Design a protein around this ligand. Sequence first.
Ligand code: COB
Length: 510
Amino acid sequence: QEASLFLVGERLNATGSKRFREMLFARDLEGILALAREQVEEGAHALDLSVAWTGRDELEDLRWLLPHLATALTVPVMVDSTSPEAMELALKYLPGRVLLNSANLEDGLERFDRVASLAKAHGAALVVLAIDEKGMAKTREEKVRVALRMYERLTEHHGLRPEDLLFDLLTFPITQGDEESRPLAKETLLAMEELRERLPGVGFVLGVSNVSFGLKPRARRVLNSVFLDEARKRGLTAAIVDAGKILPISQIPEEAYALALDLIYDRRKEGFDPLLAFMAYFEAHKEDPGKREDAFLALPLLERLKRRVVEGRKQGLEADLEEALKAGHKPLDLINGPLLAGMKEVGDLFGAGKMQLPFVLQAAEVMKRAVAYLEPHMEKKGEGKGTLVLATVKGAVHDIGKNLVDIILSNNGYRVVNLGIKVPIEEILKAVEAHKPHAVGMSGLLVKSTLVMKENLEYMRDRGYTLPVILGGAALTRSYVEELRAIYPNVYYAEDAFEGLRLMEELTGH
Ligand code: COB
């Protein structure tokens, strides 16, 4: 329509493409030049280039590759770097054909102006990321604030033309399933629309592929393509894409289109989760939606509760729990029986490669809602028997166990200070000094997490501590915690939350 979109080929990027990385390391010139020509045939108008890698001499790599790209391509190169010397080198070999990638305010005005001056001086296009000193702009209001500040500086101090600018309000993944990043696509799109109006004549660019990160190939292609189009509609001029894997909107089935939008704009309904629905669309072995729903509703009460956790079925949960409390079913039994049995099954399915990670998250969300609704119906016996600082150790994220321990001990008269997850030993002991607890609990599921526990106890030993530490987790074995007593004589293994209770009871003298 208004003008075609300037496509930038993403593939020559050490951070992004594993294939390019390995090609670069191996010094596969023919491989790289093939990959460049290929992207242009597939419809790219320019090529992003990033050779920066942890432990590699950026400048060396560029000195090698650039002379070749120079002669072997007609199209422009977008140089993706934080080193000005690198940008200079690129500007040397490819005069007139360069767009400079990062220019931003993360480390203040110093870095920003250095890059901008180059752009001005070598008459190169400039990309401007919406990142300031407080970090990445995640909302529109932020993305706009930052852009405008930058625009002022670029146009007045450097005298760059609007036309010479490309604003990258950022592209975040919305596919990992965490609640916090549901609207980060939407907020970018809103900013773009507002800035197109307030800053006429500037360009906009996005690294489109990111929005979809870690979905199946086919799903990415759709989500990428719909995002690209919606950004275009709101003023996008350039796009860092895989040119060969963007579908025109006319070729995307109506359902997939709508699901992609549902996800991008976070159009939550009552009984719908956009992300999971979008994922589900691409899965094969699709039953009659009505047939599946009927098969489910036909299950026994306990078996249906289980399947709610596995299939991640939030809606009608409180209904079913209400029903089970009406029959002779006790809260703790519903958890330690059908609900946790579901959680085990999720484990096995994820382990077999039969379930993707966000579905596991949604399973956990059903479990948490379930326990939230059941917590008032559990017995609340005793009060103020003692205190427990409880936490998941460095680099461990699983916490359904931890939280059950919280609930059960809290219900049996213990004060539980739950420090949440990934808690370093420093922070744990800070809270120990604060709350003066009778014991410390450390959760962690994976093997590596047990070695952290060992380190944690070494640390605690060395700073004089002797209060009881209760360790729990899958990979933990009682035999192993017995050995740890050589480091810290007051460690205890806990198989389950009830053992935690039993230990706390013995330790406080009940
Ligand atoms: C009650 C609780 C229910 N179960 C659960 O919480 C979930 C079990 C499940 C299915 C795992 C398989 C399984 N069958 O266990 C699995 N995940 Co998960 C896919 N996971 C998740 C889920 C958790 C969500 C949450 N908010 O907690 C997440 C998506 C976040 C998840 C994430 C990961 N997961 C991952 C993996 C690999 C595994 N995950 C496992 C643990 C498992 C075994 C499954 C697998 N499939 O292979 C993998 C680990 C193998 C191993 N190392 O040995 C990984 C790396 C996946 C990824 N590639 O990103 C990632 C971990 C990142 C990291 N550590 O940073 C889940 C759901 C699982 O059991 P529990 O053992 O925690 O508690 C139990 C409890 C009950 O009474 O008391 C005990 N206890 C535990 N701690 C303490 C105590 C008791 C006391 C008294 C204490 C003071 C502390 C005792 O250990």
